[PDB]
Amino acid sequence: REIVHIQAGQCGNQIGAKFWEVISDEHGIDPTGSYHGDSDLQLERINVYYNEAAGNKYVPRAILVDLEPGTMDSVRSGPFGQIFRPDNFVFGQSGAGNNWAKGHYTEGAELVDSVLDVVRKESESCDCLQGFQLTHSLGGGTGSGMGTLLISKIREEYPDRIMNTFSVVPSPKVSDTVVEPYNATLSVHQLVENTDETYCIDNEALYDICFRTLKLTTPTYGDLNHLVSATMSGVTTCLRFPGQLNADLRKLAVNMVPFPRLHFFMPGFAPLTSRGSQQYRALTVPELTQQMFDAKNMMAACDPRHGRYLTVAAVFRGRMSMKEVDEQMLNVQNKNSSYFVEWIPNNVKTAVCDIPPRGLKMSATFIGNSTAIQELFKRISEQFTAMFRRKAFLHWYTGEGMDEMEFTEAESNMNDLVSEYQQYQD
Amino acid sequence: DPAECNIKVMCRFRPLNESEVNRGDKYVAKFQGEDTVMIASKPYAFDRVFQSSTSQEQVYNDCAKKIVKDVLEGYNGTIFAYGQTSSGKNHTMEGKLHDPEGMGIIPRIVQDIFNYIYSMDENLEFHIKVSYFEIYLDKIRDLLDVSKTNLSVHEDKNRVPYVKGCTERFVCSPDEVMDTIDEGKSNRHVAVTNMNEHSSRSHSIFLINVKQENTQTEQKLSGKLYLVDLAGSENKSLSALGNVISALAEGSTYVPYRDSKMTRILQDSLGGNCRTTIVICCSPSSYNESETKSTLLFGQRAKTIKNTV
Amino acid sequence: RECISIHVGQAGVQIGNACWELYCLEHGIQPDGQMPDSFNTFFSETGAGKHVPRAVFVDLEPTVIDEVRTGTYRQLFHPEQLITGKEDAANNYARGHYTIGKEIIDLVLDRIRKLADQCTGLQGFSVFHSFGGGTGSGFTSLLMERLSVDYGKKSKLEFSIYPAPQVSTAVVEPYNSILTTHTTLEHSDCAFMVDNEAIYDICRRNLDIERPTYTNLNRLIGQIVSSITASLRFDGALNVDLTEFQTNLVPYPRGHFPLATYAPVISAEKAYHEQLSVAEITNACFEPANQMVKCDPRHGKYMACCLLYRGDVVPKDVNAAIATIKTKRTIQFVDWCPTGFKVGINYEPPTVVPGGDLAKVQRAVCMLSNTTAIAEAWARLDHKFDLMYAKRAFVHWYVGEGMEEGEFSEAREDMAALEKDYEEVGVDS
Ligand SMILES: Nc1nc2c(ncn2[C@@H]2O[C@H](COP(=O)(O)OP(=O)(O)OP(=O)(O)O)[C@@H](O)[C@H]2O)c(=O)[nH]1
Ligand SMILES: Nc1nc2c(ncn2[C@@H]2O[C@H](COP(=O)(O)OP(=O)(O)O)[C@@H](O)[C@H]2O)c(=O)[nH]1
């Protein structure tokens, strides 16, 4: 099987560097080097993310889409930056304006064809394609607009292969941009109707989880990114490993989406202990479920405790008892019968790889489909209206060839999306 | 708003035929009362059950007649023909377009609208527009204009949905409408190897917009009537339709129109304050007991009599 | 004489690798195929010095069949007999049965027609699947389906691992198991059932270990199964053919599902303790805590049991140990059934893994049976289904895979008459 990553925008891009920083080491691939793999198993399934050309050069099969040179020229001028074949860099030296409209209708719409071109060169690579990984932020141009287009096109070209989306939904407390809800509401819209698996991460849900669950005092972006990339590795790549009970994107999809919206999840990693001290090793297993299922530790902003779950997928990856795994999951399902929805006898989807995260003994990625994420699109949707009402920075959109009915559309859509999700919380 | 889910369902069983009798064919359907049909000893009640001999006239009167009045009344409505291929959907919807006896629901509707208009002609100024398009593989193609392919649904300023770029033709008379239908039928054909397969697979949608303004009263009225000949049930739109009907039947505040392009276009005419008649057609014939069961079940999604447990 | 076997679904393959292991282990055939008729009803003498496998392996993800062609045993099967569809598994019936699973079937069949020819007057195909899976539920559904027509004139005993009563895995499981039951029902001869959870209990209560790897449950069924084919197709003082089963085991055409049970489950480390009496093991068979199935005889009246014994057993010991039972009454057998006790005696005692956790006695009782008990197990699994179907839950996943409101609703009605069937054939006189 296979997949083809997609680094839309700067963020989605910045993260690319971290997702690939990791993944590679979790596959023994040095900058341009080959497979130094401490083992021999980190190779029989690599294909999922690379391509064979030389014999020591397995190149990441991702796409780097962005209308701001400097960015990709920071990712390509640093560490692992020199492993991507230049063909991968689909830049847009234009003005990468922070407008969803500027990267979806006017500026991005041009650079698109020169992207799809490659997304096809990579898809028609070899063997059988599974789906595409998509990273980006719903709070900017090259991210929400142009990346949200990249998919609307992808999903017309292969409505068969899957589409996981890793979105950095606009954090609450403080917005790292101003129109944010504009660029956001507009991209979520496109998401709820193309990709079929979305993993929403919040820069501040991370800080928290990174400053209190990792006594880490100076959580640089690199970190946040790093933590995130840690989860997306547990998801995909991982399951493309052996296991007593293994799954793969689809299983994950076909066990997690009760209703076609596409629904968004909230990823959570397992061993998340501070370096030295904490290295408690309390990782027998009840310790991992202890972790994963708590409020804090959910990369999302919202707290599960604020709304039932529809599905859950503990994708563990480290030798354990299909008994102490299958078992724990249960008590968990009974101690919290309250929030776990009922019309699904077994919400949880236990998954079990074998080999764990390179240096760790036992981990377990968590992919939750809780109704709690209602209380986020609400947020976003609110911010919109409060500012849409006055058409705040709307001239930067319309003046870029947009529509007063376009914004209406998205909000509503994504706004209805909130509605539905409640239809199950009850 | 009005009743909420003003959905009526009529089951129409196709005539028995000499060929079928010659074959010796075998027996699904038993009848009880106006409303019920029994298959495999299980009763299914509906608003009405029409046996094999029922006339086009009977179907129109029971199914369509009131809806047409509502449209003239200024309300929207939808009529569907649902069933397996060769169930009798097209016969029911169109029948023989020109034959006074043979004609189906659509011709009868057109006739009734104009006749009503001719009668009024006082201070009411009418305007009738028609659209004819099909949905295949969840894609919309204009039957009036073959160039318009893969059309997209949009909502206007006031939430009304529309098919962007879909041809809208103003029709003066019944003849004009029939010609339009004939044109659409012709246009359908081209680039199609197998019409049978194509016809069963693509939902045909005929839209009649009747607008009128009384010069004196100045009250203006507009009504849309969507006539739909669905794809064979033996499909994304069908499933979408099932979900919408069930939701309406439940009395749910939120209906799943977004699930298909068809349901999205139909949103203003289906459910809410609109009348909807679904004519499920079935063969009495032996094999597809199973398909009829499905059709009956689908009709059941809307609200009927619920049995005791 | 022989009985091919088709291990379908990762699980049916893991269990397969296991049951397949126990085999050579008690037949002196190293993983290299070579040993230094009898058992020919499960192994073809490709010449020659080797043995090979008299079965096949069907999974839509390579992962699991791949591992077989890594670990010793790698040498055992023919590179050919292990079918794969690089494509996608999908924990959904539909896709596995219809859409995807279809593409492979032909090819699959081909082997069970190519392997079915090579032999000499066979008896049937021991099928190994995991009810609630994608490749296991769906696929087989049509595999067994295409068999019942191509060889209606044989035995179709499918050995299933039906849904843990509370500890299921897949979120949809029931969708996949109400569908593998209805499609296979009108095609199997006798369906053996081994409950994944109810086997754990045995690992907790009758062997002590909270560390049971799947690799264990497999060693277990891998045992109970060895008692079915292996040893039985093997000479003895009271041989029992495969046909024998279905005949002495199914009272009615519904591909009736008996339950597998084993007697001596005791952990190594106990290995020295004085062995158990012919009477004790016999009695252990009537305990609802030792039956590889969460169908505790909560009321289910047995209606036929096939007590397969192996090892040192005196026919009188049996034709007495059973007599004592026939008169315990609290073990109430069906009415319309005077005597429903097929005593199968083999010679060679069991053969425990060199160092797993199985005691290793010199006699065992793999008793299987049809019990009005499953009236439950099916019930509890059917109900599940409704709850979700009642909301369509993951329905869009099948529809979009060449299925319809028909197949579900019409397979529900199916089992409905399986809840009435297993009710009527009992509880009444
Ligand atoms: N006893 C036993 N049960 C197993 C084993 N592996 C899986 N199972 C059970 O069988 C079911 C799992 O089926 P899956 O592995 O998800 O699927 P599959 O049937 O192989 O086919 P697919 O869904 O397409 O992957 C669960 O109920 C498991 O508890 C095994 O090795 N032994
Ligand atoms: N986790 C994370 N968030 C980022 C990174 N870079 C920008 N962001 C977030 O992305 C949003 C800004 O969008 P941006 O990526 O600049 O848009 P674009 O570059 O025009 O497509 C803010 O909410 C930031 O917190 C990053 O490297 N990691």
Residue numbers in the entry:
A (entry chain A): 2 to 44, 47 to 360, 369 to 437
B (entry chain C): 3 to 236, 255 to 329
C (entry chain B): 2 to 37, 47 to 439
Sentences from the paper on this structure:
Doublecortin (Dcx) defines a growing family of microtubule (MT)-associated proteins (MAPs) involved in neuronal migration and process outgrowth. Dcx and related doublecortin domain protein genes, including doublecortin-like kinase 1 (Dclk1), encode proteins with tandem MT binding domains, referred to as N-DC (or R1) and C-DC (or R2) (Coquelle et al., 2006; Kim et al., 2003; Sapir et al., 2000; Taylor et al., 2000), but the exact role of each of these dual domains is unknown. In contrast to other MAPs that bind directly on the surface of the MT protofilament, existing evidence demonstrates Dcx binding in the recess between protofilaments (Fourniol et al., 2010; Moores et al., 2004). Cryo-electron microscopy and subnanometer-resolution image reconstruction reveal the kinesin-dependent conformational variability of MT-bound Dcx and suggest a model for MAP-motor crosstalk on MTs.
In the Dcx:MT:kinesin ternary complex (Fourniol et al., 2010), although Dcx binds at the corner of four tubulin dimers, and therefore four kinesin motor domains (MDs I–IV), the Dcx density is more closely associated with kinesin motors along one of the protofilaments (MDs II and III). In this reconstruction, the MD is in a high-affinity nucleotide-free state and enabled docking of a Kif1a MD crystal structure. Residues in kinesinII (loop 2) and kinesinIII (loop 8)—which may be important for axonal specificity of some kinesins —but not kinesinI or kinesinIV, are closer than 5Å to the Dcx density. Intriguingly, the N-terminal linker region outside the proposed N-DC core interacts with the MT wall and lies close to kinesinII loop 2, while the C-terminal linker is completely displaced from N-DC due to the presence of the bound motor (kinesinIII). Addition of a kinesin MD, however, results in the undocking of the post-N-DC linker and, in addition, orientation of the pre-N-DC density in close proximity between two kinesin motor domains. Thus, because their conformation is significantly different in the absence and presence of motor protein, it is likely that residues in the linkers adjacent to the N-DC domain interact with kinesin at the MT surface and dynamically respond to the presence or absence of bound motor. Taken together with our live-cell imaging data reported for the human patient mutations W146C and S47R in Dcx, which show both a reduced overall mobility of presynaptic vesicles and a decrease in run length, our structural analysis suggests a crucial role of the N-DC domain of Dcx for regulating access of the Kif1a motor domain to MTs. It is likely that residues adjacent to the N-DC domain of Dcx interact with loop 2 and loop 8 of Kif1a at the MT surface, thus allowing a dynamic response of Dcx to the presence or absence of the motor protein.
